[PDB]
Each structure stands twice: as C-alpha cells, then as structure tokens.
C-alpha cells in the first residue's frame, strides 16, 4: 500500500539507487508491504530483492 | 556484515535496480544490517533508504 512517511534522520545516499533525505522530510513509501535486500549474484550483478525471498 | 543467502523463491525483477533470482540460487548479501524501503520525494525522485530512517506519518 502507498503511504506517506517522515524521515526520522538525514540520510546521504551511498549509491545511485539510494535517495538523499533530510530529517522531517515527507516521502511517498510506494509499497509498505515490501522491504528489500541488496544482493549480488555469481555473475557479479547487483540489485534489490524482497527480503522474504532469501534466507541464511 | 556480508553473508551468503539462499533464494527461497524465484523472483523476476520489476525495475532495473532489482535482480532476477532463482529458487536455491546462492547470493552475496552485501550488508545484512541494511533493510531498505523504496521511497519517492517531493521532486519525484525515487530511491532506496534504510527502513529505520523513516516512519509513519
């Protein structure tokens, strides 16, 4: 579900896929049912997948 | 911390920033301390931020 969220802290993005935000900024959370991990595969391609799709 | 994870399910990436994976594939989880939400700002730029950095409004 799409909901509005508020930044608790500043965040300086470390990669182009990330977003710079400031404390108290309001953002659209596009899908509150989705959390993501950044993973890298055996072919050295990197990207995001849903957290519940992988496990230790 | 970096750990190796196993895909529980196939996943077809929906955007260029996501990764296609197959069930039972082993992957590097680059930092298991980071769990990300995809958000969009007032300037209509979209990207990932760590989930503990935002909450409902």
Author numbering:
A (entry chain B): 4 to 59
B (entry chain A): 4 to 60
Q: What does the article say, verbatim?
A:
Nck proteins are composed of three N-terminal SH3 domains and a single C-terminal SH2 domain (reviewed in Ref. 3). Nck recruitment is required for complete T cell activation, and its inhibition dampens TCR signaling by reducing Zap70 phosphorylation. The objective of the present study was to initiate development of an inhibitor of the Nck/TCR interaction, specifically by blocking binding of the first SH3 domain in Nck (Nck1-SH3.1) to the PRS in the CD3ϵ subunit of the TCR. During our studies, it became clear that Nck-SH3.1 exhibits conformational diversity and can swap half the number of its residues to form a dimer.
During the crystallization efforts that led to the monomeric apo- and peptide-bound Nck1-SH3.1 crystal structures, seven more structures were determined that all exhibited domain swaps, leading to dimers. The swaps are located at the exact same position in all structures (i.e. Lys-36 in the n-Src loop), clearly visible based on the high-resolution electron density. Dimers are formed by exchange of the C-terminal 25 residues, almost half of the entire SH3 domain. The interface thus generated contains a short anti-parallel β-sheet encompassing the CD3ϵ sequence 36KSWW39. Superposition of the Nck1-SH3.1 structure with the bound CD3ϵ peptide shows that domain swap and tight peptide binding are mutually exclusive. The C-terminal half of the SH3.1-binding sequence would get into steric conflict with the second SH3.1 domain in the dimer. All of the dimers are swapped in the same manner, but with different juxtapositions of the second SH3.1 domain with respect to the first. The hinge at Lys-36 provides quite a bit of flexibility that allows the dimer to pack in many different crystal lattices. Indeed, the hinge region varies over ∼6 Å within the superposed ensemble, and the distal loop covers a distance of ∼8 Å in the dimers. Given the large number of swapped, independent chains present in different crystal forms and grown under different conditions, swapping seems an intrinsic property of this SH3 domain.
